[PDB]
mmCIF file of C-alpha atoms and ligand atoms in Angstrom:
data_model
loop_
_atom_site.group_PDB
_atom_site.id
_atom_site.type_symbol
_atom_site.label_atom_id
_atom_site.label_comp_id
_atom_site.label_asym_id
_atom_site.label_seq_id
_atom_site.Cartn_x
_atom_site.Cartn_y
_atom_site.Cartn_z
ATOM 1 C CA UNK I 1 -7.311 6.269 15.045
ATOM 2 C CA UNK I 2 -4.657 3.767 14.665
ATOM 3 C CA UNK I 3 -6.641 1.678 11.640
ATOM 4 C CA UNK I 4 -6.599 5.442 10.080
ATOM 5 C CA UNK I 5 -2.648 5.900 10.498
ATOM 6 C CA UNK I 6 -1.401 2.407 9.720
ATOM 7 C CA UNK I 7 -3.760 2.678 6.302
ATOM 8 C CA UNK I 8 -2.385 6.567 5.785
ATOM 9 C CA UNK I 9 1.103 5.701 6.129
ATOM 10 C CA UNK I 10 0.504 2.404 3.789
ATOM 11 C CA UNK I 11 -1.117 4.796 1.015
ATOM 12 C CA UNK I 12 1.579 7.083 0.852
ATOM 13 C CA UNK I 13 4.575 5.681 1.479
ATOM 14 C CA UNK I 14 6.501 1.837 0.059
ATOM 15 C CA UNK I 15 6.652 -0.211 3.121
ATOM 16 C CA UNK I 16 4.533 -1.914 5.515
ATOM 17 C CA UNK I 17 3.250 0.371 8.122
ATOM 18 C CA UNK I 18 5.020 -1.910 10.633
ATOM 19 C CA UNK I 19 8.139 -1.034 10.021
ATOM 20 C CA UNK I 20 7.406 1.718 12.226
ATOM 21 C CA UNK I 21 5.867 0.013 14.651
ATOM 22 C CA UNK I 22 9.476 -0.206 16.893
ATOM 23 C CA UNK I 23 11.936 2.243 15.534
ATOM 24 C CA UNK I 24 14.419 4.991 16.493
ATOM 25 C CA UNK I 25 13.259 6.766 19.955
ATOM 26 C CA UNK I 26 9.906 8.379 18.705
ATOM 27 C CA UNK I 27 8.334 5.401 16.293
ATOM 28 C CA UNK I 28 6.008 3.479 18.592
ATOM 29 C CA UNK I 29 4.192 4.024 21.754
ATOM 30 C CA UNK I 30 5.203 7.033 23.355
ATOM 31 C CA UNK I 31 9.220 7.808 22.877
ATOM 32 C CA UNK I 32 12.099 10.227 24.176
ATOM 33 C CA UNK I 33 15.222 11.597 23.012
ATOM 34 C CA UNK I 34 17.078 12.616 20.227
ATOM 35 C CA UNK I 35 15.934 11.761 16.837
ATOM 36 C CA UNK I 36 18.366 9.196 15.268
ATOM 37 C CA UNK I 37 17.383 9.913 11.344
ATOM 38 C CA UNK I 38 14.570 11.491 8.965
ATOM 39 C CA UNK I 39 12.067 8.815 9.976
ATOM 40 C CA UNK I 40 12.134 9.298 13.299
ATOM 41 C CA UNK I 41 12.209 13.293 13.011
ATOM 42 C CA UNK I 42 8.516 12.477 11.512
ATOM 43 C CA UNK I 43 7.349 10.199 14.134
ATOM 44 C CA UNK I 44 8.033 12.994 16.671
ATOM 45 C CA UNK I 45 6.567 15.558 14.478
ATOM 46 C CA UNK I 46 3.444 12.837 14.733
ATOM 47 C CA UNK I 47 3.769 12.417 18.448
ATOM 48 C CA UNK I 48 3.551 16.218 18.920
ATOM 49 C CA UNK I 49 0.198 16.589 16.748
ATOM 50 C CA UNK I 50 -1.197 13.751 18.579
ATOM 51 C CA UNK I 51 -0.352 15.564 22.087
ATOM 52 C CA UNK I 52 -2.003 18.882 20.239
ATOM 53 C CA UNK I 53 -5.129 17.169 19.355
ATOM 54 C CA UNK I 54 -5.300 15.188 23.049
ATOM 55 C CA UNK I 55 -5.181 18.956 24.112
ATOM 56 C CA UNK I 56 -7.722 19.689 22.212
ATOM 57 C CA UNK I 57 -10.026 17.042 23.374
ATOM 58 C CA UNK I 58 -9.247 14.547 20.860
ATOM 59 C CA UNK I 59 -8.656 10.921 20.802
ATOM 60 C CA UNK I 60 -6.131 10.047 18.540
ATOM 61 C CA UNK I 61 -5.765 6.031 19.000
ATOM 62 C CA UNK I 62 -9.271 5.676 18.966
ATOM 63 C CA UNK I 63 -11.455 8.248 16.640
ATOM 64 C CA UNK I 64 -12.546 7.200 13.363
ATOM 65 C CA UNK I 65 -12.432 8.939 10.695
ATOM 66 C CA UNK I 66 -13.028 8.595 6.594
ATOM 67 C CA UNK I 67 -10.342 9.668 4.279
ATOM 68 C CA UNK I 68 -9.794 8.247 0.523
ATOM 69 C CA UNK I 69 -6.419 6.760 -1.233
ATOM 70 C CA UNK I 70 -5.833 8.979 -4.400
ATOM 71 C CA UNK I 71 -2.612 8.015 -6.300
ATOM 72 C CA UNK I 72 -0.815 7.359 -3.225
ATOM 73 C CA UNK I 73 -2.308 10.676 -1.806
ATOM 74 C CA UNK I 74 -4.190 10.807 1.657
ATOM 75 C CA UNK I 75 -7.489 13.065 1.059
ATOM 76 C CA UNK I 76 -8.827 13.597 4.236
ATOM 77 C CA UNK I 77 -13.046 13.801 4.774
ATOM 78 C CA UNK I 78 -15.665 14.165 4.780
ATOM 79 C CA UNK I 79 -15.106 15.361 8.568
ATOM 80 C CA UNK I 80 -18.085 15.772 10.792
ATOM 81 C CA UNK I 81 -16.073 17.638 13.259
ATOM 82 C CA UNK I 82 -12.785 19.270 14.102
ATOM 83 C CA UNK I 83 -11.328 16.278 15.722
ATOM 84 C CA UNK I 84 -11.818 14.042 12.500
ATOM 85 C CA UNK I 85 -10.162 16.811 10.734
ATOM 86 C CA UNK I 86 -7.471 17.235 12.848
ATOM 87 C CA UNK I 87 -6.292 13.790 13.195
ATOM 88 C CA UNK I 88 -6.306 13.555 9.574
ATOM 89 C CA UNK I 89 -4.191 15.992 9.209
ATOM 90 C CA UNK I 90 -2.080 14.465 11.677
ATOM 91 C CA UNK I 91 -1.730 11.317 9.858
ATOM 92 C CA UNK I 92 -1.276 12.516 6.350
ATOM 93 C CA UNK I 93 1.499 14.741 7.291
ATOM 94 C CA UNK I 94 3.238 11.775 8.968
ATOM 95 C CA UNK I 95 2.757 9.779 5.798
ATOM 96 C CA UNK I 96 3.537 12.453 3.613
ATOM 97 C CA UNK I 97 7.101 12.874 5.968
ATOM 98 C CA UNK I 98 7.652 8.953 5.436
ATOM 99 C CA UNK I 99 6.787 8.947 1.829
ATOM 100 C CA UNK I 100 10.377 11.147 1.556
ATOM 101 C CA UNK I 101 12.782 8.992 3.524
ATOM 102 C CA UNK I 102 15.259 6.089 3.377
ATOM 103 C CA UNK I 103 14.926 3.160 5.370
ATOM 104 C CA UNK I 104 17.593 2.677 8.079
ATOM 105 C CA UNK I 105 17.361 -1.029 8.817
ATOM 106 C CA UNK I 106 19.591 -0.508 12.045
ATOM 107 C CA UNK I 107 17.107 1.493 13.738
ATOM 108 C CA UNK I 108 14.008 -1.520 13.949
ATOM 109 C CA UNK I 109 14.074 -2.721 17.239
ATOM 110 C CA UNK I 110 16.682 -0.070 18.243
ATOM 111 C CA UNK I 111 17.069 -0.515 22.186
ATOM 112 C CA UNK I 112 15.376 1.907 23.957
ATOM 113 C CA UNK I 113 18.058 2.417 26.777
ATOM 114 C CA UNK I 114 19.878 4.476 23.543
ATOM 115 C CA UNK I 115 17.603 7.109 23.779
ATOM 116 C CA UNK I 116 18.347 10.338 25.832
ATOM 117 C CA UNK I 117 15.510 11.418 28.694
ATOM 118 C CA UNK I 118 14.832 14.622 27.102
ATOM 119 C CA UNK I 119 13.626 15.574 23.499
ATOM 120 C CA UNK I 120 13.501 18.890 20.992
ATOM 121 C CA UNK I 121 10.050 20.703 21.835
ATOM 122 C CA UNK I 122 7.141 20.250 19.340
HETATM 123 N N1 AYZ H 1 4.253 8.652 15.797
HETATM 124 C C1 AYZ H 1 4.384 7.331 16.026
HETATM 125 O O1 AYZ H 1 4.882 6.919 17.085
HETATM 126 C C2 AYZ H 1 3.934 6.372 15.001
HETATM 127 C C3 AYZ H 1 4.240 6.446 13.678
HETATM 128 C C4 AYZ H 1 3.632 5.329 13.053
HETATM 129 C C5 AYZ H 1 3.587 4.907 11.718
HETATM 130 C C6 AYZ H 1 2.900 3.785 11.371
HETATM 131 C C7 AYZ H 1 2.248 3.031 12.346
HETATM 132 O O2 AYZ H 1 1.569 1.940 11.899
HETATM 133 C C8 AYZ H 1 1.361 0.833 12.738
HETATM 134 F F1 AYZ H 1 0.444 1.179 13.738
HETATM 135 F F2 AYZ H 1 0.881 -0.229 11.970
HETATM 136 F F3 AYZ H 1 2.618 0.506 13.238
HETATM 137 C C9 AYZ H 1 2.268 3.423 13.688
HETATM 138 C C10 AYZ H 1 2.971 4.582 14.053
HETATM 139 N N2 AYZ H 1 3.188 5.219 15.248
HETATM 140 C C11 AYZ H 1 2.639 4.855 16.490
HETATM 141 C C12 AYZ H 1 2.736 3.583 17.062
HETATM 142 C C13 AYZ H 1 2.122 3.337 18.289
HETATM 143 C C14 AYZ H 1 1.408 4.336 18.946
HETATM 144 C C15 AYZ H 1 1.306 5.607 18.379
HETATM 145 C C16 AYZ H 1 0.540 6.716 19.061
HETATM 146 C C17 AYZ H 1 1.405 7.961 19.340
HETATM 147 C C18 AYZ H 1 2.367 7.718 20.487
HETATM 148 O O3 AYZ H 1 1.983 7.258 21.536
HETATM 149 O O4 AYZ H 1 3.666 8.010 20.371
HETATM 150 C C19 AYZ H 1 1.900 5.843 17.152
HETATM 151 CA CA1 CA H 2 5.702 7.725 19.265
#
């Protein structure tokens, strides 16, 4: 759920989980359009796994699940079903993809009338 993520993406990577919160096209609720930079390439690599595990009859804003903080390392379980696992997974690799990038201050807040109608298929 989203307690799981923002605590995933604080383990991993060196900023507050808010500073995705509102960024680029993809970080935040929903999104559409091109990418603008690394960080938002992983929030819609996160927004496709979401729509893959809503698919799979998942809830991925709401399901709990346990996972441990291991030198800045998501471990995921113990899962008691597949839906725990896969949102896990979801949420590490997103941290894991935000661990890696630079911060582009310019794209907080950046005004969603910038961002195309379309996007790049998951
Ligand atoms: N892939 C993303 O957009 C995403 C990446 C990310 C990272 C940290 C985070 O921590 C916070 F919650 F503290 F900000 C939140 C994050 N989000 C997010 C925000 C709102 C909704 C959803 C559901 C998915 C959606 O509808 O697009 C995800
Ligand atoms: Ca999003």
């Amino acid at each position: 759920g989203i307690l799981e993520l923002a605590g995933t993406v604080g383990c991993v990577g060196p900023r507050t989980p808010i500073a995705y919160m509102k960024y680029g096209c993809f970080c935040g609720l929903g999104g559409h359009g091109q990418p603008r930079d690394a960080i938002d390439w992983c929030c819609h690599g996160h927004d496709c796994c979401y729509t893959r595990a809503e698919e799979a009859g998942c809830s991925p804003k709401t399901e709990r699940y346990s996972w441990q903080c291991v030198n800045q390392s998501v471990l995921c379980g113990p899962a008691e079903n597949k839906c725990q696992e896969l949102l896990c997974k979801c949420d590490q690799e997103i941290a894991n993809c935000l661990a890696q990038t630079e911060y582009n201050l310019k794209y907080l807040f950046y005004p969603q009338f910038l961002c195309e109608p379309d996007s790049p298929k998951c």
